[PDB]
Amino acid sequence: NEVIKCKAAVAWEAGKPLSIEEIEVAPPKAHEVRIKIIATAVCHTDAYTLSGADPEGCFPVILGHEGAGIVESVGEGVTKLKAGDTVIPLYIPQCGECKFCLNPKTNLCQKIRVTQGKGLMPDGTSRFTCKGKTILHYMGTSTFSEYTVVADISVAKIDPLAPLDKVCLLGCGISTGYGAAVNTAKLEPGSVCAVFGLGGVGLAVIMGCKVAGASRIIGVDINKDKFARAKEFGATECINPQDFSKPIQEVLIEMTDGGVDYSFECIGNVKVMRAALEACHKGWGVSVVVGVAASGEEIATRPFQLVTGRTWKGTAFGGWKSVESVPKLVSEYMSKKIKVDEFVTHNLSFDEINKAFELMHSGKSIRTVVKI
Amino acid sequence: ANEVIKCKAAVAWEAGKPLSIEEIEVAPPKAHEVRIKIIATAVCHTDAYTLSGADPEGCFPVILGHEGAGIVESVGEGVTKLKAGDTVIPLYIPQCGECKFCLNPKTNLCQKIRVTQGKGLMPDGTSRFTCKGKTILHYMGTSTFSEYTVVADISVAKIDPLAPLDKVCLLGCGISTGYGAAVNTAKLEPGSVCAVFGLGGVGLAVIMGCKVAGASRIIGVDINKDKFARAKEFGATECINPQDFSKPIQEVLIEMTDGGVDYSFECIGNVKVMRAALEACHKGWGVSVVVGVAASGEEIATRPFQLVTGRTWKGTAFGGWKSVESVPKLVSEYMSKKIKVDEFVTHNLSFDEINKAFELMHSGKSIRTVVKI
Ligand SMILES: NC(=O)c1ccc[n+]([C@@H]2O[C@H](COP(=O)([O-])OP(=O)(O)OC[C@H]3O[C@@H](n4cnc5c(N)ncnc54)[C@H](O)[C@@H]3O)[C@@H](O)[C@H]2O)c1
Ligand SMILES: NC(=O)c1ccc[n+]([C@@H]2O[C@H](COP(=O)([O-])OP(=O)(O)OC[C@H]3O[C@@H](n4cnc5c(N)ncnc54)[C@H](O)[C@@H]3O)[C@@H](O)[C@H]2O)c1
Numbered sequence A: 001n002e003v004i005k006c007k008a009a010v011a012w013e014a015g016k017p018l019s020i021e022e023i024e025v026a027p028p029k030a031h032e033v034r035i036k037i038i039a040t041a042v043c044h045t046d047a048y049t050l051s052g053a054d055p056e057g058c059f060p061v062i063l064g065h066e067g068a069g070i071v072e073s074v075g076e077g078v079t080k081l082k083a084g085d086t087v088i089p090l091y092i093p094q095c096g097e098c099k100f101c102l103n104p105k106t107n108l109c110q111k112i113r114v115t116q117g118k119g120l121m122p123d124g125t126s127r128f129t130c131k132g133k134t135i136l137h138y139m140g141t142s143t144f145s146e147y148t149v150v151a152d153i154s155v156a157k158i159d160p161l162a163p164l165d166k167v168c169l170l171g172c173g174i175s176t177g178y179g180a181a182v183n184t185a186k187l188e189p190g191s192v193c194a195v196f197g198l199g200g201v202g203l204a205v206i207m208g209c210k211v212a213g214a215s216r217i218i219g220v221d222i223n224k225d226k227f228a229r230a231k232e233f234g235a236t237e238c239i240n241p242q243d244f245s246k247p248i249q250e251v252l253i254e255m256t257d258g259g260v261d262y263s264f265e266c267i268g269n270v271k272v273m274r275a276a277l278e279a280c281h282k283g284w285g286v287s288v289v290v291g292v293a294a295s296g297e298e299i300a301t302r303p304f305q306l307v308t309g310r311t312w313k314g315t316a317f318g319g320w321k322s323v324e325s326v327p328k329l330v331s332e333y334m335s336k337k338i339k340v341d342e343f344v345t346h347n348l349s350f351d352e353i354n355k356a357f358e359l360m361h362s363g364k365s366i367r368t369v370v371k372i
Numbered sequence B: 001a002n003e004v005i006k007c008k009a010a011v012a013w014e015a016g017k018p019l020s021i022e023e024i025e026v027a028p029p030k031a032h033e034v035r036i037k038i039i040a041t042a043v044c045h046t047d048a049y050t051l052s053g054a055d056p057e058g059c060f061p062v063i064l065g066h067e068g069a070g071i072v073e074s075v076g077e078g079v080t081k082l083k084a085g086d087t088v089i090p091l092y093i094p095q096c097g098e099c100k101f102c103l104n105p106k107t108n109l110c111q112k113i114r115v116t117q118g119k120g121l122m123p124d125g126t127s128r129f130t131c132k133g134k135t136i137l138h139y140m141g142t143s144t145f146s147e148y149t150v151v152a153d154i155s156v157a158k159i160d161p162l163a164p165l166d167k168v169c170l171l172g173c174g175i176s177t178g179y180g181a182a183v184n185t186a187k188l189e190p191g192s193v194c195a196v197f198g199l200g201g202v203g204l205a206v207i208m209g210c211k212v213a214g215a216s217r218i219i220g221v222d223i224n225k226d227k228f229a230r231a232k233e234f235g236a237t238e239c240i241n242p243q244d245f246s247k248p249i250q251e252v253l254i255e256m257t258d259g260g261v262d263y264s265f266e267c268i269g270n271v272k273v274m275r276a277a278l279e280a281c282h283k284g285w286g287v288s289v290v291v292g293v294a295a296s297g298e299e300i301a302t303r304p305f306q307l308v309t310g311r312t313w314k315g316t317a318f319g320g321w322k323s324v325e326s327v328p329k330l331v332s333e334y335m336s337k338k339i340k341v342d343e344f345v346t347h348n349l350s351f352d353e354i355n356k357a358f359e360l361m362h363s364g365k366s367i368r369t370v371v372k373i
């Protein structure tokens, strides 16, 4: 395999638009896979890292972690994947061998986390160069490029008939929200639910709640424009905290004769995380933190809330063991068990990638799919 | 029932003062009430919390006590499942069997009588206690610091009539709570690695539960090293003192378990330690159970990263036991030697020495002191 010259959206520094550049992509080393990215989407954390607020965000970097494509080539020792395979790259890998992969209670494979956090392949180097400069990887995926290189354990092999301009969304938001409901919460039929934040993650939670047979699904958002789509996904009603003088947890307790069976925070706001917990019913209430708060911020409550029977938990990528689960999720979409198309609110070409960031900031999008 | 009973009780006349052995009057039970002759009672931390005046819900004068065992003296109108002579433990968490909570297998927090109970009253909104012309309040629905108490009929567990009441009184709170925290709330699997913060009666019962469930490691944590010997006797595989280390206790535990424990239990009531107990749990699957009851208004905190990376924060009340059905089963486990009770009794006193039990509790020298009425 040879060096590939191709287009990528490079973030040279924080707080600036992405630069469409000509880059070089090195061939895959041992146990690496080079992927032709066919479609990618833009998510909140891409923007967060780009802003410079991320304490562990480093530049220059090729962002992007919601993608789908085709294996261009594989490195030495790779036998399970081959050129032509249809794939989704994974920011949570599955080595299948570490104590985390071997434990049915978690999906947090630890094999490559240190190098990945530093924007590096497992051997401690990057495959990206541009204008004489090394360009860092992001979240083990770097999908904002015509070609990326990932660890061989960061790859889900999927249905070759899957529409890649849709299933790229199973790389993050949809899988996370859906899994929060069905894996982390494991909510029972008839459950009363509250979902805080009605972006793609929140909608996917609602979707999961409906699949699980929830009786009541209350969407909560400060942006009432989000309500229509939430109802389409199955929210039985929607409320705006701004419309009430009382704290949102008191409103929810009032509405539900004690609080919800399950709540989901899909914002990353620590005050709302507390509200979501306190909005849960005494005795059996469970709150799942899905939102990723800014570093240093703390969640708080009175321990009485736990002693009186509420449970606080969280989720990472919906708890899915990624390599085994993502193909199954693609199969659920193909069989119309779950929705994917309904999350796509905008479509752009690669050169227009910055407009996807603009759409996010405005609050006008769920997911924008960028066609490479 | 029958008539008014004139007996002795330990009255708390006022916050911040010792208990006074007074001559009191105990009214006969009304409909769906049960009058119990208390044979043995013990003193628990929350009795002192209320006595101190620090409890915003504490009201005086009051007859305290909620760990007790006795014999039914008489029953009110409409009571059929209990009769004079039945061997019983009074329950601060009742089980009406009919409310939303009783009907839900995930909880034991019966709500049937909680409002009146919170006010120190029977379900009809009145007290059965008087002393020197004054109304004396009930406490935790139990008021065990009396020769005779009256409780709601849903606040009674009928137990093995061969059970020694100077031992099984302890199943009315501490032992049951700790044991249940392990086997009910955590439901730990065989082979689990556990940490127990606080090595009083509650912590010891957690250790007992972890051993019953087949934990591979049980790490006891206490700033009082005098607690270590009994903790090991109960099944602690090792014991550590936070004061012996320069770094936070959660870092210490992560180091000794290669990532953190599978299950942690806070058995103190300290919000800083509660955070530490959560953070000492293993990434991905760790579970921390809050058992300690913190002072009012105090808050627990952590970074949400701790939950997003797979730790779970829970709590428990009376070990999650649906009380009326479970406490007799817990007595049976004691009688069959599946669980320990006798080993929790470190001191024994007479009723007129009840204040010494409080002294022993605050000096750190006791686990449980049983007071013989
Ligand atoms: N845990 C994981 O594995 C994981 C995976 C993907 C995304 N996330 C996180 O999930 C969160 C949501 O992602 P998204 O793509 O849906 O974002 P989004 O911006 O599209 O949606 C967030 C929504 O929250 C609403 N909101 C903001 N403040 C609110 C408040 N005070 N009360 C009620 N609603 C409020 C906004 O109006 C918005 O609609 C982000 O924090 C993201 O980082 C976590
Ligand atoms: N949740 C419930 O239903 C329930 C039921 C019974 C008791 N409790 C609570 O459980 C807690 C413990 O009860 P107990 O009877 O065992 O009390 P205890 O006072 O006998 O035991 C507490 C132990 O914690 C230790 N300790 C104090 N600070 C510490 C620290 N910083 N680090 C490590 N250890 C520390 C003390 O040395 C003591 O041995 C109390 O708060 C009590 O109210 C709760």
Ligand SMILES: Cc1cc(C(N)=O)ccc1-n1c(CCC(=O)O)ccc1-c1ccc(-n2ccnc2)cc1
Pocket: A043, A044, A045, A091, A092, A108, A109, A110, A113, A116, A117, A138, A139, A140, A172, A292, A315, A316, A317, B308, B309
């Ligand atoms: C999965 C992940 C990747 C990175 C990274 N930079 O590669 C940083 C944090 C996380 N991360 C971890 C740590 C995983 C571990 O330690 O094994 C737990 C949860 C996350 C995580 C962080 C962010 C998101 N996220 C938010 C929006 N889109 C994806 C999803 C998951």
Ligand SMILES: Cc1cc(C(N)=O)ccc1-n1c(CCC(=O)O)ccc1-c1ccc(-n2ccnc2)cc1
Pocket: A307, A308, B044, B045, B046, B092, B093, B109, B110, B111, B114, B117, B118, B139, B140, B141, B173, B293, B317, B318
């Ligand atoms: C069970 C109990 C009794 C009283 C009371 N004073 O009667 C107050 C709080 C609680 N309580 C509640 C009630 C909340 C509710 O049901 O809505 C939940 C948990 C408790 C509770 C309070 C204190 C203790 N405790 C601490 C030490 N010994 C017993 C154990 C449990």
Ligand SMILES: [K+]
Pocket: A185, A186, A187, A188
């Ligand atoms: K569940």
Ligand SMILES: [K+]
Pocket: B186, B187, B188, B189
């Ligand atoms: K368990």
Ligand SMILES: [Zn+2]
Pocket: A043, A044, A045, A065, A066, A172, A173
């Ligand atoms: Zn994302």
Ligand SMILES: [Zn+2]
Pocket: A093, A094, A095, A096, A097, A098, A099, A100, A101, A108, A109, A110, A111
């Ligand atoms: Zn692994």
Ligand SMILES: [Zn+2]
Pocket: B094, B095, B096, B097, B098, B099, B100, B101, B102, B109, B110, B111, B112
């Ligand atoms: Zn009830």
Ligand SMILES: [Zn+2]
Pocket: B044, B045, B046, B066, B067, B173, B174
């Ligand atoms: Zn107690």
